[PDB]
């Protein structure tokens, strides 16, 4: 059926959505280790200064 | 009857010598199918007892891979069945009689090592299905899941080429061949309600196009059973 093949290309852009919003969340937990890198590199130049103190 | 009974006679001459019987068997396949019903339908007493002699040659021990010739007849032309009826049935030849037991028991050792795993092996090489009781059965298909979904789902993708087949000759749309379609499609259905694994397997191999054209065909019954199909596939 015709319209039964649209609606498995539906299901594929679902699946296409579903893989790009897993892909979002993985984006995300990229971003996350970058935002956990700012926060330890503050720490680190605070260490530095004691260092140097 | 003459001419059938002489033409039984030269056959029976024939596969005397196991090599003749051998190369006879890979012959003609349903011969031995076509000789049971013959004998079945026949009443004489010679023309059985000669039938029973022939049959019992082609599945004889001298004769070469005499376990896999009666497997595969009693898998394809539904040997032992036919060997129950005739031997619940009462022939007036006592030779005949023998050679019917005699049979039959053959048949029941063979069927006693076979089981349904190979009758439905065997259906999906033929390529004829007429809803078996296998099909029906929830615990066969429970107990078979794995196993048609092993060696890379073979089981599964031989399920799919046959619908495919059938699919294509949906254009004669045959009794038996709606028949066969409608317990494809029950197979295929069985099959991705349990290990749900080989449903995208089939839909890689076109499964689900198939089902969908399947959906518009003029049979009342093909058409229900692709919808039950896709139901059980993304429907509710």
Same mark, same amino acid.
């Given at each position: 059926?015709?319209?039964?093949?649209?609606?498995?290309?539906?299901?594929?852009?679902?699946?296409?959505?579903?893989?790009?919003?897993?892909?979002?969340?993985?984006?995300?937990?990229?971003?996350?280790?970058?935002?956990?890198?700012?926060?330890?590199?503050?720490?680190?130049?605070?260490?530095?200064?004691?260092?140097?103190? | 009857?003459?001419?059938?009974?002489?033409?039984?006679?030269?056959?029976?001459?024939?596969?005397?010598?196991?090599?003749?019987?051998?190369?006879?068997?890979?012959?003609?396949?349903? %011969?031995?199918?076509?000789?049971?019903?013959?004998?079945?339908?026949?009443?004489?007493?010679?023309?059985?007892?000669?039938?029973?002699?022939?049959?019992?040659?082609?599945?004889?021990?001298?004769?070469?891979?005499?376990?896999?010739?009666?497997?595969?007849?009693?898998?394809?032309?539904?040997?032992?069945?036919?060997?129950?009826?005739?031997?619940?049935?009462?022939?007036?030849?006592?030779?005949?009689?023998?050679?019917?037991?005699?049979?039959?028991?053959?048949?029941?050792?063979?069927?006693?090592?076979?089981?349904?795993?190979?009758?439905?092996?065997?259906?999906?090489?033929?390529?004829?299905?007429?809803?078996?009781?296998?099909?029906?059965?929830?615990?066969?298909?429970?107990?078979?899941?794995?196993?048609?979904?092993?060696?890379?789902?073979?089981?599964?993708?031989?399920?799919?080429?046959?619908?495919?087949?059938?699919?294509?000759?949906?254009?004669?749309?045959?009794?038996?061949?709606?028949?066969?379609?409608?317990?494809?499609?029950?197979?295929?259905?069985?099959?991705?309600?349990?290990?749900?694994?080989?449903?995208?397997?089939? %839909?890689?191999?076109?499964?689900?196009?198939?089902?969908?054209?399947?959906?518009?065909?003029?049979?009342?019954?093909?058409?229900?059973?692709?919808?039950?199909?896709?139901?059980?596939?993304?429907?509710?």
């Amino acid at each position: 059926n015709g319209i039964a093949t649209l609606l498995q290309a539906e299901k594929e852009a679902h699946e296409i959505v579903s893989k790009a919003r897993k892909y979002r969340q993985d984006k995300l937990k990229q971003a996350k280790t970058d935002a956990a890198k700012e926060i330890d590199s503050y720490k680190i130049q605070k260490d530095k200064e004691l260092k140097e103190f | 009857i003459q001419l059938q009974y002489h033409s039984l006679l030269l056959i029976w001459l024939l596969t005397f010598n196991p090599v003749f019987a051998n190369e006879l068997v890979q012959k003609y396949l349903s %011969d031995f199918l076509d000789l049971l019903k013959l004998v079945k339908i026949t009443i004489k007493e010679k023309v059985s007892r000669l039938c029973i002699s022939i049959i019992l040659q082609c599945c004889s021990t001298r004769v070469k891979q005499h376990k896999k010739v009666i497997k595969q007849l009693l898998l394809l032309g539904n040997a032992l069945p036919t060997v129950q009826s005739l031997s619940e049935r009462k022939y007036s030849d006592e030779e005949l009689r023998q050679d019917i037991s005699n049979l039959k028991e053959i048949l029941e050792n063979e069927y006693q090592e076979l089981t349904s795993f190979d009758e439905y092996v065997a259906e999906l090489d033929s390529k004829l299905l007429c809803w078996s009781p296998p099909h029906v059965d929830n615990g066969f298909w429970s107990d078979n899941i794995d196993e048609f979904k092993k060696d890379n789902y073979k089981i599964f993708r031989q399920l799919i080429e046959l619908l495919q087949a059938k699919v294509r000759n949906g254009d004669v749309n045959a009794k038996q061949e709606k028949i066969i379609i409608q317990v494809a499609l029950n197979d295929i259905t069985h099959v991705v309600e349990l290990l749900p694994e080989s449903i995208d397997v089939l %839909d890689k191999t076109g499964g689900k196009a198939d089902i969908m054209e399947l959906l518009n065909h003029s049979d009342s019954r093909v058409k229900y059973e692709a919808l039950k199909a896709t139901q059980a596939i993304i429907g509710y």
